[PDB]
Amino acid sequence: HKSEVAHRFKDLGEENFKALVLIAFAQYLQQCPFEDHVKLVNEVTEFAKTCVADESAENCDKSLHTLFGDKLCTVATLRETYGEMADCCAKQEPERNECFLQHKDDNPNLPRLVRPEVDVMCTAFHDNEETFLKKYLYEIARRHPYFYAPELLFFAKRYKAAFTECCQAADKAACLLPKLDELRDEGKASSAKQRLKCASLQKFGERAFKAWAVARLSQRFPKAEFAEVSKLVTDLTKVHTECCHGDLLECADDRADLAKYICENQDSISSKLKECCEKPLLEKSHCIAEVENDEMPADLPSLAADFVESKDVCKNYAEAKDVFLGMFLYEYARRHPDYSVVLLLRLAKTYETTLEKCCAAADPHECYAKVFDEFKPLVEEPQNLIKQNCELFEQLGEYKFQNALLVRYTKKVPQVSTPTLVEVSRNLGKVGSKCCKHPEAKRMPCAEDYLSVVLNQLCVLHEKTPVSDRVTKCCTESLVNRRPCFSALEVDETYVPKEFNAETFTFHADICTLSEKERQIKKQTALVELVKHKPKATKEQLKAVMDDFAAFVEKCCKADDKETCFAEEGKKLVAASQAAL
Numbered sequence: 001h002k003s004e005v006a007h008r009f010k011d012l013g014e015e016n017f018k019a020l021v022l023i024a025f026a027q028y029l030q031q032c033p034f035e036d037h038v039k040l041v042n043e044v045t046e047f048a049k050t051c052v053a054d055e056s057a058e059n060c061d062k063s064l065h066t067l068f069g070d071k072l073c074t075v076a077t078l079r080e081t082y083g084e085m086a087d088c089c090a091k092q093e094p095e096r097n098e099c100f101l102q103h104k105d106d107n108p109n110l111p112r113l114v115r116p117e118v119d120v121m122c123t124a125f126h127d128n129e130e131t132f133l134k135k136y137l138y139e140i141a142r143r144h145p146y147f148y149a150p151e152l153l154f155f156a157k158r159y160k161a162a163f164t165e166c167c168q169a170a171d172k173a174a175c176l177l178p179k180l181d182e183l184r185d186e187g188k189a190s191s192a193k194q195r196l197k198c199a200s201l202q203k204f205g206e207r208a209f210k211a212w213a214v215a216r217l218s219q220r221f222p223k224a225e226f227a228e229v230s231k232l233v234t235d236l237t238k239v240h241t242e243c244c245h246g247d248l249l250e251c252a253d254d255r256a257d258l259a260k261y262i263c264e265n266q267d268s269i270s271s272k273l274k275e276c277c278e279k280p281l282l283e284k285s286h287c288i289a290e291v292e293n294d295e296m297p298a299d300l301p302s303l304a305a306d307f308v309e310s311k312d313v314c315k316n317y318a319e320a321k322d323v324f325l326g327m328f329l330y331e332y333a334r335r336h337p338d339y340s341v342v343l344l345l346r347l348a349k350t351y352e353t354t355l356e357k358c359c360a361a362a363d364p365h366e367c368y369a370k371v372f373d374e375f376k377p378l379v380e381e382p383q384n385l386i387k388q389n390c391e392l393f394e395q396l397g398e399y400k401f402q403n404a405l406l407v408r409y410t411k412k413v414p415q416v417s418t419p420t421l422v423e424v425s426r427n428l429g430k431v432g433s434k435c436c437k438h439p440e441a442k443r444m445p446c447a448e449d450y451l452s453v454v455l456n457q458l459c460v461l462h463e464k465t466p467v468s469d470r471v472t473k474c475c476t477e478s479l480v481n482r483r484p485c486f487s488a489l490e491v492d493e494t495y496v497p498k499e500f501n502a503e504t505f506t507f508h509a510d511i512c513t514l515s516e517k518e519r520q521i522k523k524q525t526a527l528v529e530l531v532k533h534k535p536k537a538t539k540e541q542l543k544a545v546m547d548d549f550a551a552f553v554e555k556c557c558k559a560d561d562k563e564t565c566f567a568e569e570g571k572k573l574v575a576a577s578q579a580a581l
């Protein structure tokens with residue numbers, strides 16, 4: 001490996017290389033025009049080829065950080081456009097790179113991306129495919145600077161396929177749109193997840209992170225052994241640390257290494273790991289990261305022997321507390337891939353707590369004798385919540401279910417913005433659709449996956465615009481209590497009903513024209529406001545008032561002279577309803 005670029009150019013291949021150089025440059029110099037980045041990419045790619053032909057060529061020996069930072073610094077409009085960022089160019093390489101990560105803006109001053117009409121895209125996709133997709137890769141990159149390049153390039157490829165496929169179907173829109181919607185949600189899910197771990201790591205430090213990783217790695221590699229798990233948990237923690245920092249190169253290298261490791265010692269980690277290991281450089285770590293839980297050895301002891309029924313428990317504990325507890329997690333985790341990771345941590349913490357008290361008491365072994373009895377309620381709590389909510393989501397579909405929640409949460413935290421309460425209840429409803437379709441054994445892990453982001457998103461908003469100490473409490477609690485905290489919120493009997501507003505419960509015929517999506521959001525916002533106005537109304541009373549409305553919109557969007565039925569019949573409703581409630 002005389003040349004670093006030549007070597008990466010080779011593993012990566014021209015197509016992927018160019019794409020990644022584009023993303024890398026876009027995530028840094030986020031305010032430079034596309035045509036400019038394209039020039040850079042062609043320069044670097046030309047240089048890289050030069051080195052593939054002669055590893056001895058000028059500058060081919062330099063590092064990726066030196067070449068990258070060197071290219072960034074050549075931009076003549078740097079100072080004028082970026083300013084301070086241009087002062088990094090004065091520093092020595094070591095510090096230069098670090099200076100750039102500092103001025104790497106997360107969430108810049110750029111306009112939201114409006115999605116064109118399927119036919120304009122498709123036509124753009126035909127007359128000129130590379131620059132169509134490159135310009136958009138560029139637009140997405142500059143807006144998500146901390147989004148792991150490769151994982152972004154992965155989505156890019158999926159977008160290209162949607163166009164290749166759909167842009168050749170009689171009814172493109174009916175094809176394309178549903179795909180552009182799924183990918184967007186996935187990209188948005190992916191992004192929130194990444195931001196969410198760098199948050200956890202930062203807030204709760206390495207210990208909790210490691211605890212989290214142990215439980216997760218064990219559920220997936222049950223056949224693996226604690227020594228291997230800890231190994232990976234350590235390397236994994238280094239990786240996340242480095243990737244969160246935002247240094248793509250270091251982060252990439254670290255991931256490539258970790259991937260090679262897992263694959264070589266594959267037989268020692270998991271059986272469901274061949275595919276990923278046969279895949280090319282770029283998709284290896286990504287593949288492994290999404291891997292499925294291996295089947296757990298069918299011959300495995302009872303935690304009660306090595307953790308409860310034993311003596312010398314406190315000795316093994318006091319000898320190396322965290323390692324012992326990590327052993328409890330690894331043991332309990334590989335036996336329960338049907339538990340959420342935080343439920344596992346919830347158990348480890350309960351265990352740690354009794355050990356601390358019992359190992360200090362007269363007859364230890366007897367003090368912590370009935371420890372698993374304490375685990376019981378901690379497990380059924382999330383189990384019942386899931387049973388409860390899926391038993392419900394079944395009867396009244398996604399929309400109606402979205403409405404039951406709306407009523408539920410609006411009543412718990414009325415001070416929240418109506419459009420916010422709609423967004424959350426809307427998301428939570430989709431979680432029900434996504435997860436309730438799974439058998440009991442895969443539900444808890446599913447809910448946790450989705451809720452975790454929703455709950456974090458939820459908390460970020462409250463941060464900027466506080467509204468309730470209660471929400472703040474749950475938001476600033478341990479990630480292990482976060483959800484159960486929210487689940488504990490009660491009806492706000494302090495809240496003072498908001499003033500009746502005729503304008504608020506006044507609807508026109510436009511609703512008949514709007515899309516199912518808009519019709520819903522419209523009626524949904526009305527429901528929130530209805531609860532905000534008469535919060536002490538029964539679920540029965542609310543149903544009645546909601547049925548009259550169902551009829552109202554119908555008997556009005558199917559009526560001669562549409563706008564009077566909405567003005568005349570509406571007046572009646574609001575009048576009847578006021579009296580009913």
Ligand SMILES: CCCCCCCCCCCCCCCC(=O)O
Pocket residue numbers: 005008020021024044064067068071150252253255256259281282283284285286
């Ligand atoms: C002029 C120098 C530019 C530097 C070249 C662009 C950086 C591309 C290197 C990224 C390689 C990523 C390898 C995949 C790692 C993984 O498995 O996650």
Ligand SMILES: CCCCCCCCCCCCCCCC(=O)O
Pocket residue numbers: 207208210211214230233322323325326329345346348349352478479480
């Ligand atoms: C290989 C060693 C990994 C370390 C494992 C540590 C086990 C600790 C288990 C307690 C749960 C940690 C939850 C963090 C939230 C909190 O601080 O209460």
Ligand SMILES: CCCCCCCCCCCCCCCC(=O)O
Pocket residue numbers: 385409413416420424455458459461462467471483486487488
């Ligand atoms: C901008 C601030 C947002 C505040 C909105 C608070 C709405 C409550 C969200 C609760 C979701 C957590 C799921 C708990 C499930 C349960 O009810 O048990």
